[PDB]
Amino acid sequence: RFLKVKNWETDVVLTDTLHLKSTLETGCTEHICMGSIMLPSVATKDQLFPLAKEFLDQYYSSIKRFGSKAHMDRLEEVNKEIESTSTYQLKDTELIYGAKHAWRNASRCVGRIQWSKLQVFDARDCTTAHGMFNYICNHVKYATNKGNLRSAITIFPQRTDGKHDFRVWNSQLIRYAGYKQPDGSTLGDPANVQFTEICIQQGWKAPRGRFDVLPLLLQANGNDPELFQIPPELVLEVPIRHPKFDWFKDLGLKWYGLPAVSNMLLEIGGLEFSACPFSGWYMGTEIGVRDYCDNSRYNILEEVAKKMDLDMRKTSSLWKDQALVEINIAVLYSFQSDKVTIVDHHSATESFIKHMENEYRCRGGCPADWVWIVPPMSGSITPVFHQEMLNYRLTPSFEYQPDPWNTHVWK
Ligand code: HEM
Ligand SMILES: Cc1cc(N)nc(-c2cc(CNCCF)cc(F)c2F)c1
Ligand SMILES: C[C@H](O)[C@H](O)[C@H]1CNc2nc(N)[nH]c(=O)c2N1
Numbered sequence: 274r275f276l277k278v279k280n281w282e283t284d285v286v287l288t289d290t291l292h293l294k295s296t297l298e299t300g301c302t303e304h305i306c307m308g309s310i311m312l313p314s315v316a317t318k319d320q321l322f323p324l325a326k327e328f329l330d331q332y333y334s335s336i337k338r339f340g341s342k343a344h345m346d347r348l349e350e351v352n353k354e355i356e357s358t359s360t361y362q363l364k365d366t367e368l369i370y371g372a373k374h375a376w377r378n379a380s381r382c383v384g385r386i387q388w389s390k391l392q393v394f395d396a397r398d399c400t401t402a403h404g405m406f407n408y409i410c411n412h413v414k415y416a417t418n419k420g421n422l423r424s425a426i427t428i429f430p431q432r433t434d435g436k437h438d439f440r441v442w443n444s445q446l447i448r449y450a451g452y453k454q455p456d457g458s459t460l461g462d463p464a465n466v467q468f469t470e471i472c473i474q475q476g477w478k479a480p481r482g483r484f485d486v487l488p489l490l491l492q493a494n495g496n497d498p499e500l501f502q503i504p505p506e507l508v509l510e511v512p513i514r515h516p517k518f519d520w521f522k523d524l525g526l527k528w529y530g531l532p533a534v535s536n537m538l539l540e541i542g543g544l545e546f547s548a549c550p551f552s553g554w555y556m557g558t559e560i561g562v563r564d565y566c567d568n569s570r571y572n573i574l575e576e577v578a579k580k581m582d583l584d585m586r587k588t589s590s591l592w593k594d595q596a597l598v599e600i601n602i603a604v605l606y607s608f609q610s611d612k613v614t615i616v617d618h619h620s621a622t623e624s625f626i627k628h629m630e631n632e633y634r635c636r637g638g639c640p641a642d643w644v645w646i647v648p649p650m651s652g653s654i655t656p657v658f659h660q661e662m663l664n665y666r667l668t669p670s671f672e673y674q675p676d677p678w679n680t681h682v683w684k
């Protein structure tokens with residue numbers, strides 16, 4: 274019941290008891306495991322007080338005043354507001370706690386060692402898409418911090434009826450555009466081609482190039498979303514060069530500094546925040562391996578292989594592997610030489626093991642998704658490969674939600 278997880282590099286073992294506080298479900302049964310399924314599987318007032326109660330109890334436990342007069346009255350108070358409004362409102366304190374802990378509990382995040390250093394921007398007074406643009410802009414500018422990136426989150430008004438949702442329709446605040454071609458192939462980011470057509474559908478005038486920064490599509494209080502372009506001076510980009518291969522610049526690649534997921538759902542005390550964009554800094558691989566070398570993304574192994582002169586006739590020459598290592602030395606070097614915050618897959622996976630050590634110490638566990646924690650290259654020469662990890666769902670939590678253009682009632 275109180276399980277053991279081992280590291281097969283270090284022979285270290287840690288006992289996980291935190292999984293007893295697990296509430297949600299995984300998709301695995303006693304007879305099947307789904308830990309490589311990517312995305313497995315209104316809210317009334319009866320269900321809402323249990324969730325509020327459990328959240329308020331761990332928050333008051335947290336500040337070392339478990340069950341004091343404050344906790345008692347704040348429970349009675351929240352119950353009364355759930356009778357009255359069939360919902361309730363978080364204190365600013367409770368919002369910042371819930372947000373930091375949704376991160377803390379994000380089992381697919383390797384960077385969680387920083388979970389307590391998180392800047393929460395309360396945008397629950399927002400009422401318009403224009404006010405969303407403004408709140409998002411100061412988030413970008415603050416978290417970019419002249420390349421010295423800072424972790425942040427901007428939390429928009431919580432969901433109420435369900436047809437009055439605040440949604441950023443973008444999947445990340447800053448992404449490059451996707452255009453297919455007359456000949457069928459694709460310029461820019463093939464991941465984004467449907468979205469880019471939607472922005473163009475709403476009148477975005479496309480500069481039909483490669484690294485075209487998409488505009489924000491912002492829906493406020495359930496209304497039809499509206500286009501706003503982040504001022505370019507606020508979008509920091511890093512030009513990729515190599516420390517050795519001076520033909521690297523001719524490749525003409527570049528990436529934005531700021532990873533900022535905008536399409537997910539934040540859950541606190543059973544209250545649901547449909548718009549909650551959050552940013553940190555990049556681990557090198559997401560750019561070098563996934564963005565640049567996914568077959569369905571930028572797909573540059575083709576060219577980098579050529580300009581090195583590699584044996585591309587044979588699959589077993591590992592020309593793909595060699596060209597992948599060079600690409601990731603260049604992303605890191607480019608980011609580091611401009612003092613833009615970035616972490617390399619060795620330094621970040623080592624911190625996660627350290628973070629894991631602390632979590633099992635002062636919390637009794639650490640949800641973790643091995644399928645996602647292992648970097649997408651050099652797997653077993655990173656220590657997380659060798660670390661058994663228990664996955665389970667704690668709350669407060671970040672959750673996936675459907676793309677808004679499949680649900681939205683539109684006119
Ligand atoms: C501080 C620097 C951070 C680093 C280095 C980092 C690193 C990463 C990486 C490499 C991934 C895998 C992304 C992918 O493959 O799609 C990831 C996922 C994730 N990150 Fe972190 N992150 C950071 C900050 C944050 C913050 C501030 C939050 C939220 C408050 C967060 C929440 C998440 C969540 C919920 C996931 C999994 C959900 C998903 O991407 O599908 N991270 N992170
Ligand atoms: C806060 C944060 C830190 C970091 N290092 N990466 C990301 C990050 C996450 C995603 C999407 N994750 C769901 C994929 F469907 C995409 C990106 F392009 C990212 F950059 C986010
Ligand atoms: C099939 C599998 O679930 C899918 O490729 C996952 C594997 N692990 C991943 N890990 C990270 N960090 N990011 C991803 O997109 C994925 N994709």
Ligand SMILES: [Zn+2]
Pocket residue numbers: 301305306307308
């Ligand atoms: Zn499983």
